[PDB]
Ligand binder design. Sequence first.
Ligand SMILES: CCCCCCCCCCCCCCCCCC(=O)OCC(COC(=O)CCCCCCCCCCCCCCCCC)OC(=O)CCCCCCCCCCCCCCCCC
Ligand SMILES: CCCCCCCCCCCCCCCCCC(=O)OCC(COC(=O)CCCCCCCCCCCCCCCCC)OC(=O)CCCCCCCCCCCCCCCCC
Ligand SMILES: CCCCCCCCCCCCCCCCCC(=O)OCC(COC(=O)CCCCCCCCCCCCCCCCC)OC(=O)CCCCCCCCCCCCCCCCC
Ligand code: HEA
Ligand code: HEA
Ligand SMILES: CCCCC/C=C\C/C=C\C/C=C\C/C=C\CCCC(=O)O[C@H](COC(=O)CCCCCCCCCCCCCCCCC)COP(=O)(O)OCCN
Ligand SMILES: CCCCC/C=C/C/C=C\CCCCCCCC(=O)O[C@H](COC(=O)CCCCCCCCCCCCCCC)COP(=O)(O)OCC[N+](C)(C)C
Ligand SMILES: CCCCCC/C=C\CCCCCCCCCC(=O)O[C@H](COC(=O)CCCCCCCCCCCCCCC)COP(=O)(O)OC[C@@H](O)CO
Ligand SMILES: CCCCCCCCCCO[C@@H]1OC(CO)[C@@H](O[C@H]2O[C@@H](CO)[C@@H](O)[C@H](O)[C@@H]2O)[C@H](O)[C@H]1O
Ligand SMILES: C[C@H](CCC(=O)O)[C@@H]1CC[C@@H]2[C@H]3[C@H](O)C[C@@H]4C[C@H](O)CC[C@]4(C)[C@@H]3C[C@@H](O)[C@@]21C
Ligand SMILES: C[C@H](CCC(=O)O)[C@H]1CC[C@@H]2[C@H]3[C@H](O)C[C@@H]4C[C@@H](O)CC[C@]4(C)[C@@H]3C[C@@H](O)[C@@]21C
Ligand SMILES: C[C@H](CCC(=O)O)[C@H]1CC[C@H]2[C@@H]3[C@H](O)C[C@@H]4C[C@H](O)CC[C@]4(C)[C@H]3C[C@H](O)[C@]12C
Ligand SMILES: C[C@H](CCC(=O)O)[C@H]1CC[C@H]2[C@@H]3[C@H](O)C[C@@H]4C[C@H](O)CC[C@]4(C)[C@H]3C[C@H](O)[C@]12C
Ligand code: CUA
Ligand SMILES: [Cu+2]
Ligand SMILES: [Mg+2]
Ligand code: NA
Ligand SMILES: [Zn+2]
Lengths: 105, 49, 144, 227, 514, 84, 43, 58, 49, 73, 46
Amino acid sequence: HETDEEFDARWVTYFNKPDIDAWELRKGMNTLVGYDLVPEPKIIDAALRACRRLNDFASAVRILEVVKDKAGPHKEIYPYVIQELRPTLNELGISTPEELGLDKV
Amino acid sequence: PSITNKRIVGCICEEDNSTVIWFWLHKGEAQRCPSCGTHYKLVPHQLAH
Amino acid sequence: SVVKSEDYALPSYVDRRDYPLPDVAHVKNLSASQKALKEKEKASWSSLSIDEKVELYRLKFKESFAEMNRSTNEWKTVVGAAMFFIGFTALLLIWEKHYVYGPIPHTFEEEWVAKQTKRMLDMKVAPIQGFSAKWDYDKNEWKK
Amino acid sequence: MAYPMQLGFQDATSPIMEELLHFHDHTLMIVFLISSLVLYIISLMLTTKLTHTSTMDAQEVETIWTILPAIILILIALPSLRILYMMDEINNPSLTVKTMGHQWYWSYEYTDYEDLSFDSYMIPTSELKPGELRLLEVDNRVVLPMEMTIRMLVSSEDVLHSWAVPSLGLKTDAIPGRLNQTTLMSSRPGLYYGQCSEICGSNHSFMPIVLELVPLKYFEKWSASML
Amino acid sequence: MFINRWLFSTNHKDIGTLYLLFGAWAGMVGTALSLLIRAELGQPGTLLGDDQIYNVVVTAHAFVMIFFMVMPIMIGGFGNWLVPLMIGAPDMAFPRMNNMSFWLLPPSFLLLLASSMVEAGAGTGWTVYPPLAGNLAHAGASVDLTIFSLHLAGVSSILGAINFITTIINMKPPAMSQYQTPLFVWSVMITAVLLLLSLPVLAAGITMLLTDRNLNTTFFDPAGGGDPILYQHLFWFFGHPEVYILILPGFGMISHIVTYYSGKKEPFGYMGMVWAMMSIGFLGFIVWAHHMFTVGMDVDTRAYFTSATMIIAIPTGVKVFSWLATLHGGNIKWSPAMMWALGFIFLFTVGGLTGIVLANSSLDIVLHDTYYVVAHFHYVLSMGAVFAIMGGFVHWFPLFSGYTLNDTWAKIHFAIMFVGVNMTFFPQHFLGLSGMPRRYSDYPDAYTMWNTISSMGSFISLTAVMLMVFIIWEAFASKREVLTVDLTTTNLEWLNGCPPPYHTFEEPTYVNLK
Amino acid sequence: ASAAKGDHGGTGARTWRFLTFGLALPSVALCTLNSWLHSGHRERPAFIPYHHLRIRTKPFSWGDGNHTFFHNPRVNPLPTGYEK
Amino acid sequence: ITAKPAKTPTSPKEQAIGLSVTFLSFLLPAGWVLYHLDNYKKS
Amino acid sequence: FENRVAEKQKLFQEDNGLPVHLKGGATDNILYRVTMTLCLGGTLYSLYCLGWASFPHK
Amino acid sequence: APDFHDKYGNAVLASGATFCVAVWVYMATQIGIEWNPSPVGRVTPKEWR
Amino acid sequence: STALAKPQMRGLLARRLRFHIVGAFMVSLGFATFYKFAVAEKRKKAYADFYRNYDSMKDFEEMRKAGIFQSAK
Amino acid sequence: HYEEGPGKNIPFSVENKWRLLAMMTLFFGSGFAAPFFIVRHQLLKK
Ligand SMILES: CCCCCCCCCCCCCCCCCC(=O)OCC(COC(=O)CCCCCCCCCCCCCCCCC)OC(=O)CCCCCCCCCCCCCCCCC
Ligand SMILES: CCCCCCCCCCCCCCCCCC(=O)OCC(COC(=O)CCCCCCCCCCCCCCCCC)OC(=O)CCCCCCCCCCCCCCCCC
Ligand SMILES: CCCCCCCCCCCCCCCCCC(=O)OCC(COC(=O)CCCCCCCCCCCCCCCCC)OC(=O)CCCCCCCCCCCCCCCCC
Ligand code: HEA
Ligand code: HEA
Ligand SMILES: CCCCC/C=C\C/C=C\C/C=C\C/C=C\CCCC(=O)O[C@H](COC(=O)CCCCCCCCCCCCCCCCC)COP(=O)(O)OCCN
Ligand SMILES: CCCCC/C=C/C/C=C\CCCCCCCC(=O)O[C@H](COC(=O)CCCCCCCCCCCCCCC)COP(=O)(O)OCC[N+](C)(C)C
Ligand SMILES: CCCCCC/C=C\CCCCCCCCCC(=O)O[C@H](COC(=O)CCCCCCCCCCCCCCC)COP(=O)(O)OC[C@@H](O)CO
Ligand SMILES: CCCCCCCCCCO[C@@H]1OC(CO)[C@@H](O[C@H]2O[C@@H](CO)[C@@H](O)[C@H](O)[C@@H]2O)[C@H](O)[C@H]1O
Ligand SMILES: C[C@H](CCC(=O)O)[C@@H]1CC[C@@H]2[C@H]3[C@H](O)C[C@@H]4C[C@H](O)CC[C@]4(C)[C@@H]3C[C@@H](O)[C@@]21C
Ligand SMILES: C[C@H](CCC(=O)O)[C@H]1CC[C@@H]2[C@H]3[C@H](O)C[C@@H]4C[C@@H](O)CC[C@]4(C)[C@@H]3C[C@@H](O)[C@@]21C
Ligand SMILES: C[C@H](CCC(=O)O)[C@H]1CC[C@H]2[C@@H]3[C@H](O)C[C@@H]4C[C@H](O)CC[C@]4(C)[C@H]3C[C@H](O)[C@]12C
Ligand SMILES: C[C@H](CCC(=O)O)[C@H]1CC[C@H]2[C@@H]3[C@H](O)C[C@@H]4C[C@H](O)CC[C@]4(C)[C@H]3C[C@H](O)[C@]12C
Ligand code: CUA
Ligand SMILES: [Cu+2]
Ligand SMILES: [Mg+2]
Ligand code: NA
Ligand SMILES: [Zn+2]
């Protein structure tokens, strides 16, 4: 296969394509969640910014939700990810699912 | 090619894949295979003159 | 919002943990205020209110992950009902014993069984482990 | 015979039946191990929110789950075959007894020296003496000498039947026009029961086999007296 | 229009529907017979009569469950419905001959019911061994009606096999190789090949029994130089392949169900699954004499059959572990169909393992013709084959009808059936080890407890069968029409909607060769 | 016969490779298992100077003219019996 | 799978009726035969 | 003999909506009715025979 | 909004379990069923000869 | 106002499988050890113990005196 | 040609759930009852 850093770089590059379209955005996220891993924050950052370029706020939030979901019972993952993503969330004005009340059943 | 405005496409993404990806291709803008992204475009009607 | 039968050939919406971004938006038709919200969405999201962000989410998706992954009380109904039907089965067995089955052979009478048991012990049935092995031939009783 | 609430095999009366008990314990352990392992793995796969839905490679884990079962099969086959050949060993009997299956009873023939033969019928439930077993007792038992290698020849004069004595590890089909051989050797005196083991019609459930194992001296006097 | 559509059909979906209806009705008959069996054994003594009436019931139970319920449902029902849809074919290769395969079943069933009506019935065991099945021990028309019933069912399956093999080989999209077809399609073709090769041998054998009974031949009569054991060889040469024929389509449906409810786009190790089914199909033709370990065969022959029989565990093991590997990492959907599939995996494994115990000719001396065999085969048939059928039924019912079942009721049905079958058959292992013979209408007193518990379990299963009928009624009564189905990209049979139109794939799918 | 497998939709390289590794080689592995199991040196039979065996009408063109080409001392007796 | 609401809803009362009728269709005929078993055995 | 296949091709391709088993003409209808009558009648007769054979004639 | 299970779940489980246990215990001990348990520890062997 | 440590984020399902497969193996060994003691060995010792000083004639005598035989009174 | 769609691709009608209940009851009931009546037939011959 390839090293962890080559995998991550391939993904960051994917989401950073300036003219990435909506289809490519969905394809990327839908494909990425099939792997045995929770995406590194650098990947998520690139995906969130692709959402900004596509004027898609809802997808940005959904991406945050899937990050949490992929962690399964490892509750320490999501809060770390959100911590690493804070500058970006603030810059782009992205509210976490918790801040929107979408974490309550 | 199609004689109507939609046709089922089966995409064998990579040579030797045992899994075929199936989807309806509609008249209009080209659509992409849900799995590998290759493009397909429907070109409707005729056959029988 | 409203799905139709003959739309089976068209891309559809689904709420799945492993397919976070569905093929279509939950709501495709927009009202005047909704169209305006989609416009406001093109500007800084910091200017969007919590309520507006929730509405944008709700236009794109039907249920949040928390909502779609909720557990239910269905197991109570399943287990309770299964037990009720298993209980009902015993009623059928009661009916059977009463109206269908006649008396069992005389060899099950208490006295016959006591005698048959001594005879089995006399012929030393299963003396290594199974039966006679459980009888104390010296103290003349079942081994404690 | 079987006793109320019995779980496993009737206690072994012959050395071969003892051999089968140990072989069954060996195999059953493997059956328990594999079935519980499968049950466990099912529960393991179903108890996590973690996912991996992309393509998984198979040519690596298939080696393990091909080689292991192959090894386990060999660990079962070895003792299985050892016992199989042991049952076929040349032993040279001291006595030969024949049994003919009939539509609903067994007949026996001890024709080595004298021409002794008799029918063996199930004792009707209405005629059982106190303490006797329902469906299992016969009027004339197969008296045989204990601690001796006996050759049993089995055939039938009508339909198929099958001569069986679980405690001794025996079951030989009774086929008309054919003479099947098996060897019997009881390590102890006593009464040993069996039942017809091939569907033969109306009273297939009611044509039991009862062996009476006694010392050679009693077997001989019984033989004479039975002429 | 009604007659044209339902009596003169040349449509694979309608014909599959006829098969599912026939098989459901047969299942009711087979269930009633199984209750009669367990009622007779429910307490010591005689309930119905002697072994004749009892064994007429046991024999019919087997024929009905095997030939009229399992085969018609799996091959004729699921096979006809799904195979053409899964390869994008417009119908079967021989759509008219396909209809005759179906219509031969009702007559076949009528002959079976006739045999039990005339004389004293055929109380021979489903194996129909002579001389008991001969014209002296079973004089009269009964056994002959049974033979003719088998002939018709045989022709039905042989023509069905020719149709399936031709359809699967010849009617896939030009770009699709055999290694690009779904596992269910593979399971059906392999099953068809086994049917094609094994049934003619059975036909040969039962025709010889028919002539011995009516034309004074003596193939199995020692008086004319015949041999009863010859019949056993001819029967079991068909008989073992037959049990693999009963489970193969089940294996196919299990692969689809496990894959689907694990949220996977494909089963783990596809080529290993194809390899396993083909190996099983092959090995299934060279192990038949393990049904004859007590007839008096040479020790070397017995050593061979013991060894050859065990080898099947290897490819079967690859399938079991591949199903578990398909569950691995899945987003598990706890639907009723998945429950049936999970129960299948475990219970079939148990039954398969007791089969490996029986493979040992040494041990089989003591286990043969006892309830240990009955326990083994009911685990693989009444739990394996039946669970695969129930799983497939609940999974595809919305496709076939266009309506959904009530999932809660279906989960209740599974729970009841699970308890029922296990309570019925598990205790039978004890009865077998301790020596209780097969085909007995009554047993020695020591066997009472386990037989009592086993009969109670059979009543629990009856309750599940009755509930199932109600569940199907509720679905059709409420009319909840299907909207959307997930994973259509890897389940082509659902792509034309629920139910698909009478004519599907009039315009074939487009598949690039690249 | 038709075997008990299936394919036939197009017999190609992939199919023959599948047969090589999935049927052929496994068969060879089994027969190799069976053979290197039932081996073991069998007790050589008593020597009997039968006239129809150990034929010598002309000496062999090698060795001492009395030993066969692949002579095995352990199992091949000379016309006069086994060797020392 | 998603589906539309029932076109002709079957209420709890209606289900009790269908379940009862279904169970009776199986139990009554067999029960009748089994009950008259002795009358059959010797007649 | 002369080749009249073209005549037969015209007859069987004639757009009259008739299924192939009746497309030859009135004789097809007669043959069909005879076949089906013997089949259904014979089946009723076999049912009668089964009813007869089901009971002992001591 | 509360479904069938939220409203009736606890009741169905409770009275289903209760009914099942009650009727099975009754069938097993009050209707004359012969279970034929082991004599071991329960039967006092009596002279038969 | 403390930061959080980067936890393990890759191969969590695989890691879990490995751990439990190893545990399943250990439990299989413990069960094998248990079975080949509570069942296998127990059986061998029961038979060996029974036959060690077994007297078949004494056993027969007892059965005869109990009157179970047809051929020996 | 033929009717298509839910409730139309079957040989029985589902237009009325009660008439349907009656049909299913006769269908499945006749199957389950048959063996009992055949047993009865065999007992009443001899
Ligand atoms: C390290 C591991 C430990 C981790 C601990 C667990 C953590 C969970 C993680 C968490 C990972 C994800 C789990 C949750 C996902 C979705 C939950 C939900 O939203 O959906 C809610 C659903 C989901 O259901 C479940 O979720 C559990 C049901 C499981 C049924 C399994 C059936 C298996 C059949 C095959 C048997 C062999 C294999 C069984 C194997 C089963 C393995 C679980 O609730 C139900 O109502 C369905 C079950 C109904 C009835 C039980 C089945 C009857 C079986 C037969 C005996 C009956 C005896 C009664 C009648 C009695 C009369 C006498
Ligand atoms: C209803 C039956 C009641 C019987 C009660 C037994 C009474 C004990 C007196 C307690 C009295 C103790 C003194 C007796 C010792 C004599 C030992 C012997 O010489 O006799 C040896 C005999 C006796 O057997 C035993 O040594 C006891 C083993 C018992 C296993 C019980 C499993 C129970 C599961 C619960 C429901 C059944 C269905 C499950 C399906 C399992 C498939 C087999 O060995 C056998 O050949 C029987 C079993 C044969 C084949 C089954 C193999 C696969 C098992 C799978 C296990 C799954 C576990 C997961 C857990 C299961 C989750 C479902
Ligand atoms: C034997 C038949 C019983 C008679 C009852 C009928 C009465 C008619 C009155 C008549 C009153 C007029 C009413 C008309 C319309 C509705 C009733 C119907 O049309 O009437 C008949 C129809 C419909 O069938 C029914 O009537 C109701 C069936 C309901 C079935 C629900 C099944 C649910 C399971 C799911 C199946 C797959 C569908 C899902 C997927 C959806 C499909 C795509 O049948 C058929 O035309 C073809 C079926 C042929 C064979 C099936 C098994 C028969 C085996 C017989 C062998 C006997 C040997 C001797 C045995 C002799 C006995 C001793
Ligand atoms: C669905 C039907 C079905 C199936 C699939 C099987 C499968 C098997 N059967 Fe069974 N069998 C019957 C139906 C079936 N059988 C019937 C009806 C009878 C009685 C007929 C009559 O007399 O009326 C019978 C009788 C029968 C006998 C004759 C017993 C006797 O009469 O004395 C034997 C003998 O060997 C046997 C063996 C096997 C074996 C070894 C398998 C194997 O295919 C099983 C393989 C599976 C596994 C082993 C489990 C999964 C594997 C793993 C988890 C891998 C690891 C395993 C190991 C290392 C062992 N069967
Ligand atoms: C597929 C085969 C099959 C099935 C499912 C069963 C199921 C059952 N059988 Fe089996 N049985 C055999 C095949 C089968 N049997 C064979 C081959 C014999 C040997 C015959 C001989 O010795 O000659 C036998 C023998 C036999 C005996 C031994 C008789 C003896 O030796 O004296 C017993 C005893 O208890 C018994 C009991 C039962 C019971 C209680 C069930 C119950 O589990 C049944 C419960 C009900 C069902 C599982 C049917 C449900 C399915 C449907 C109704 C279809 C539904 C419709 C749709 C989904 C479309 N059977
Ligand atoms: C290893 C398997 C492969 C087999 C061949 C390999 C080596 C042997 C050398 C040449 C063989 C070629 C053809 C066969 C000719 C004669 C039979 C030889 C087969 C063989 O090798 O047989 C051996 C005898 O060798 C003997 O005499 C061999 C003596 C060698 C003499 C060769 C004489 C040549 C005669 C050739 C005539 C050829 C005419 C050919 C005509 C063709 C058409 C015109 C058997 O050994 P043994 O000890 O008796 O028994 C074993 C006891 N442990
Ligand atoms: C009786 C005898 C039988 C008894 C026991 C047999 C059980 C086997 C036990 C362990 C098997 C070990 C398999 C090792 C595979 C590693 C798993 C993994 O982690 O899965 C993938 C490997 O693909 C891959 O092999 C594909 C994914 C996983 C491959 C194997 C998974 C299946 C394992 C079996 C499932 C359980 C069923 C066991 C049956 C007994 C992950 O890929 P990468 O890291 O490259 O990419 C991720 C991106 N990175 C680079 C940034 C991290
Ligand atoms: C008395 C004791 C038991 C009696 C049992 C009697 C059972 C049935 C008797 C009546 C059946 C005869 C009627 C003729 C059957 C012909 C089938 C046929 O010829 O079927 C063909 C297919 O099989 C093919 O080719 C190749 C295959 C040809 C098969 C011919 C059918 C013969 C039926 C008997 C088979 C016995 C099995 C043999 C093994 C022992 C044609 O397929 P269709 O779907 O029609 O059309 C497709 C269209 O595209 C054609 O234009
Ligand atoms: C294995 C499958 C079967 C499972 C067991 C069946 C479950 C019970 C079903 C009830 O069926 C019936 O019960 C009766 C009694 O409870 C009968 O009445 C009968 O008995 C009477 C009352 O004692 C009389 O009033 C009438 O003459 C009469 O025929 C009767 O005919 C029959 O329909
Ligand atoms: C269409 C029908 C087939 C019905 C079916 O497939 O079950 C066929 C067509 C023509 C046949 C009929 C023919 O008209 C000949 C028969 C004589 C009478 O004039 C009318 C009924 C008569 C006794 C037949 C009954 C009918 O059911 C037949 C056998
Ligand atoms: C009439 C026909 C010529 C071609 C045509 O039909 O135009 C001829 C040519 C060859 C045929 C004949 C062949 O020579 C074979 C046969 C030989 C004769 O001895 C008898 C008739 C015989 C069976 C044939 C009858 C004849 O009428 C045929 C049919
Ligand atoms: C070569 C063939 C197909 C590969 C392909 O073309 O994709 C594959 C499919 C299944 C494989 C077999 C199965 O995986 C089972 C066995 C597994 C062992 O790891 C080697 C031999 C073994 C017998 C395999 C040999 C070979 O690799 C097979 C037969
Ligand atoms: C069972 C059958 C005979 C049937 C009959 O008597 O009609 C015979 C014919 C040929 C036999 C086989 C062949 O003789 C070759 C093998 C010889 C070995 O000693 C045992 C297995 C072995 C594979 C045999 C098994 C079995 O006895 C076979 C298959
Ligand atoms: Cu004699 Cu069964
Ligand atoms: Cu077999
Ligand atoms: Mg037998
Ligand atoms: Na009985
Ligand atoms: Zn693609």
